[PDB]
Amino acid sequence: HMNINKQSPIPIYYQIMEQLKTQIKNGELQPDMPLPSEREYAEQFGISRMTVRQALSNLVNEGLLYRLKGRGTFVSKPKMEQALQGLTSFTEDMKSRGMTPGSRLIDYQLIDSTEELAAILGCGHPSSIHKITRVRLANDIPMAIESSHIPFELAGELNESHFQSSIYDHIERYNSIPISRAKQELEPSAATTEEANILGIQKGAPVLLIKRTTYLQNGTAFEHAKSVYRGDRYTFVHYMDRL
Amino acid sequence: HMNINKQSPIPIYYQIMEQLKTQIKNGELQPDMPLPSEREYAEQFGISRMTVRQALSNLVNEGLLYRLKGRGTFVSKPKMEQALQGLTSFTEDMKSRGMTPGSRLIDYQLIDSTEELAAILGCGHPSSIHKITRVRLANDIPMAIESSHIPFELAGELNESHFQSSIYDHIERYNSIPISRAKQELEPSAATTEEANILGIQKGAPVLLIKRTTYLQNGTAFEHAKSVYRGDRYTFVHYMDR
Ligand SMILES: N[C@@H]1[C@@H](O)[C@H](O)[C@@H](COP(=O)(O)O)O[C@@H]1O
Ligand SMILES: N[C@@H]1[C@@H](O)[C@H](O)[C@@H](COP(=O)(O)O)O[C@@H]1O
């Protein structure tokens, strides 16, 4: 199934870890069928069982796999439940679940309003708009890519210390008005080459494409954001009623 | 670029229609850009413009393309906005959009409860559970595949006429109580070969996978459902507050 090249300078255990990772990334491994045994892998490739064991144990310690006594070794399927109706920040979302939020700046641009953005935000035109594009990390694992358009006057000058923490925190502080309401539009999608590369997932893997338009308590729109969320680590939850 | 085969029994305009359809299907030509002109198509394939015009006009009449004056012909992107917070039936969703809801039965089985299903539904074990798997149609265009699990006692015996109609309407009538509340779980997915073939979309095309547990006004769960919705024809909407 996988491919081991003994002539390569990459150690065999490392090859196994990487190829199993690539297999989980590619969907090639069912999540609750057991992995091939140490024996099966070792015989298949003509390598030591201890080499196989080294790889599998490392993967367990990285949480990508888990052992069930008497049943074998299984692919981990960690998925966070994300509530759709509570208006929150990524930073709030992560801290609530005891994980450390982070960000890496993909791109920052101050841009001229378009008439389309101006219609969405109800902001001036012509005006200047922050365009803040970040990958959002949970314990240094990329979870999403978000591109947030915010009218300049609702945020003022921004620097790397804003980008590396919570934009919503800054928005409330800077405007002295809390964040109160949003509208979101959800669409399933396949990760583009670039999205996959930044997210560490396979090209074309399932992502949820989300557009959010977010409002201050005085009813001013301060954000129009377009984001892609990793399908493989998220479950989006909401409720419904007749009203 | 398309592949026109003039030795084929299939008429050229029909090829153009089908290959354009396939191209839209496979997301191969941008929805914001205008198609190549009548002339460009004709000159590329060494065919008559009138053949091209026949194919494009047909596709306009089918609503797959549209003509913007002076700018060109464009790929239509019919989106239907689906509100996530309002508990409704497919039948209700369509009617309120002035469209005709239909269903095609994929499979019906009356099945034994499992400890897993009984936990979800709070139903009896062992008991019988309806398992109703249908294609849901909007004016004869497939929109979703749904597999609904419903405890026998909350629905009684069902036949093909129930399947072709609204299950939710039956449920409220049978139980003399309104359908009141639900929890849904959402995740994006790629359409399986089977899901794609039934939905008329490309293998691997984006779909929304949705699990619904649905409750009657008295707190009784009556449905556990697993569905896939075509990503291309839906926009799911909800609101948020603090
Ligand atoms: N999907 C939203 C984004 O639309 C928003 O821009 C972000 C701000 O998060 P933070 O305040 O941590 O910068 O929160 C969520 O993730
Ligand atoms: N997603 C829901 C399904 O979970 C539900 O089973 C169906 C019933 O629709 P109907 O009453 O038309 O049969 O409505 C929607 O489509």
Side-chain angles (χ1 to χ4, degrees), chain A residues 1-68 70-76 78-243, chain B residues 2-29 31-67 69-76 78-114 116-242:
Chain A
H1 200 194
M2 40 161 67
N3 199 350
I4 301 305
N5 310 71
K6 296 188 184 184
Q7 286 289 121
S8 173
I10 304 301
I12 289 146
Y13 86 86
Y14 194 105
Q15 293 185 45
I16 301 174
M17 295 178 64
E18 280 293 284
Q19 279 185 62
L20 269 182
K21 283 171 172 172
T22 298
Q23 273 183 358
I24 300 179
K25 277 179 44 172
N26 282 2
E28 313 196 10
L29 291 199
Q30 297 169 313
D32 321 289
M33 289 276 282
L35 272 74
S37 73
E38 294 196 350
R39 180 174 158 183
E40 300 183 71
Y41 280 128
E43 288 177 355
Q44 162 78 358
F45 297 110
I47 57 180
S48 164
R49 290 200 202 178
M50 292 310 295
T51 303
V52 178
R53 180 174 303 159
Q54 176 177 358
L56 295 187
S57 301
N58 283 347
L59 288 174
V60 170
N61 301 341
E62 295 183 14
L64 288 159
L65 300 179
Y66 65 100
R67 291 179 169 111
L68 287 171
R71 291 333 300 160
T73 291
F74 294 89
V75 180
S76 296
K79 307 203 79 177
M80 306 177 15
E81 282 204 355
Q82 184 62 39
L84 280 181
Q85 284 160 266
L87 179 48
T88 64
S89 74
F90 184 81
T91 296
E92 293 170 329
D93 291 341
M94 288 310 103
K95 295 200 286 191
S96 88
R97 305 164 162 88
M99 310 174 77
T100 302
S103 297
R104 286 189 297 264
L105 191 69
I106 295 170
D107 176 70
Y108 169 77
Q109 293 180 80
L110 189 55
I111 74 169
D112 286 312
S113 56
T114 66
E115 319 215 329
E116 184 207 333
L117 267 180
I120 292 175
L121 284 319
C123 67
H125 182 70
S127 74
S128 290
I129 302 174
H130 297 283
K131 186 183 179 184
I132 310 155
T133 305
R134 302 181 290 163
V135 53
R136 318 302 310 276
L137 305 314
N139 294 345
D140 293 289
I141 299 180
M143 292 294 276
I145 305 170
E146 307 196 303
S147 188
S148 174
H149 309 69
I150 297 164
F152 188 90
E153 289 308 325
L154 298 181
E157 300 285 341
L158 294 180
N159 62 67
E160 187 68 44
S161 74
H162 298 106
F163 304 150
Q164 280 189 259
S165 51
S166 161
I167 290 294
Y168 278 17
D169 208 58
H170 172 75
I171 284 289
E172 292 198 324
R173 203 186 311 104
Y174 183 83
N175 291 275
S176 307
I177 309 172
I179 294 165
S180 56
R181 233 173 69 65
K183 175 179 182 185
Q184 286 197 150
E185 286 169 41
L186 310 176
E187 182 168 358
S189 200
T192 67
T193 299
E194 298 82 9
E195 293 162 358
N197 189 43
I198 290 175
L199 286 169
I201 63 184
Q202 179 190 39
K203 169 185 176 60
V207 300
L208 193 62
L209 177 53
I210 308 187
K211 280 191 273 180
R212 176 183 287 196
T213 298
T214 327
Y215 295 85
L216 299 178
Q217 199 179 7
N218 66 358
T220 289
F222 72 90
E223 169 187 54
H224 180 73
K226 316 186 300 183
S227 318
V228 281
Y229 284 78
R230 294 176 68 154
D232 65 341
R233 294 185 90 91
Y234 277 103
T235 305
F236 297 91
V237 173
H238 71 93
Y239 296 84
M240 328 171 74
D241 50 38
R242 286 301 263 191
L243 314 161
Chain B
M2 316 179 188
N3 187 13
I4 301 308
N5 193 333
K6 306 190 187 182
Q7 316 167 38
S8 172
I10 297 191
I12 295 168
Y13 88 86
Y14 192 105
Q15 299 186 36
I16 296 174
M17 285 181 73
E18 280 287 290
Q19 275 178 76
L20 262 177
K21 276 169 184 168
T22 292
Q23 272 180 0
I24 304 172
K25 199 177 190 184
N26 287 0
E28 295 181 32
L29 66 321
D32 61 304
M33 301 279 282
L35 290 156
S37 68
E38 182 180 284
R39 271 209 279 151
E40 289 178 283
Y41 275 127
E43 250 162 82
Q44 181 163 5
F45 297 117
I47 63 186
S48 166
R49 284 217 227 157
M50 304 306 300
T51 299
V52 176
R53 180 179 312 179
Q54 181 183 357
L56 293 178
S57 293
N58 285 342
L59 289 170
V60 161
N61 300 345
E62 278 174 27
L64 284 17
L65 300 176
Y66 64 105
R67 299 201 201 272
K69 175 182 153 60
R71 295 176 64 185
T73 301
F74 297 90
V75 180
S76 295
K79 293 298 264 206
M80 184 184 316
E81 283 182 41
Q82 184 67 33
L84 288 177
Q85 278 147 300
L87 181 46
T88 63
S89 65
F90 183 82
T91 293
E92 279 170 336
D93 286 331
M94 295 300 104
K95 285 181 177 170
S96 78
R97 296 181 175 82
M99 305 173 76
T100 302
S103 291
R104 215 188 289 122
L105 187 73
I106 291 303
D107 182 74
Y108 173 74
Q109 311 174 50
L110 191 265
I111 73 175
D112 297 305
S113 51
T114 78
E116 186 197 280
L117 264 163
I120 300 178
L121 294 167
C123 67
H125 186 45
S127 58
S128 284
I129 295 177
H130 297 279
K131 187 194 190 168
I132 309 154
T133 303
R134 310 179 283 171
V135 204
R136 314 308 306 278
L137 295 305
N139 296 337
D140 290 320
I141 308 170
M143 295 293 279
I145 305 167
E146 318 196 293
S147 189
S148 173
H149 301 61
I150 296 170
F152 180 85
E153 60 197 316
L154 296 176
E157 190 208 323
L158 308 163
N159 55 68
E160 179 72 60
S161 68
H162 293 114
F163 305 152
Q164 298 297 315
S165 173
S166 172
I167 294 290
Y168 276 17
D169 185 80
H170 172 78
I171 289 292
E172 290 191 325
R173 295 184 186 273
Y174 185 87
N175 291 281
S176 305
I177 196 175
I179 295 167
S180 171
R181 180 194 145 251
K183 172 166 179 178
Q184 283 195 151
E185 296 173 337
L186 277 47
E187 85 175 79
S189 196
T192 65
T193 303
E194 297 84 352
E195 288 158 3
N197 279 0
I198 292 164
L199 285 171
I201 58 187
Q202 159 190 46
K203 171 182 173 57
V207 292
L208 198 52
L209 173 63
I210 306 187
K211 285 179 208 177
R212 176 182 294 190
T213 305
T214 325
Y215 298 80
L216 300 173
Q217 194 173 258
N218 70 344
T220 296
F222 73 94
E223 174 182 49
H224 185 60
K226 306 186 302 162
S227 317
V228 298
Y229 296 80
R230 318 163 57 143
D232 64 339
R233 292 180 86 92
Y234 274 103
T235 289
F236 303 90
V237 177
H238 67 96
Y239 294 86
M240 330 175 71
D241 38 47
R242 223 155 153 63

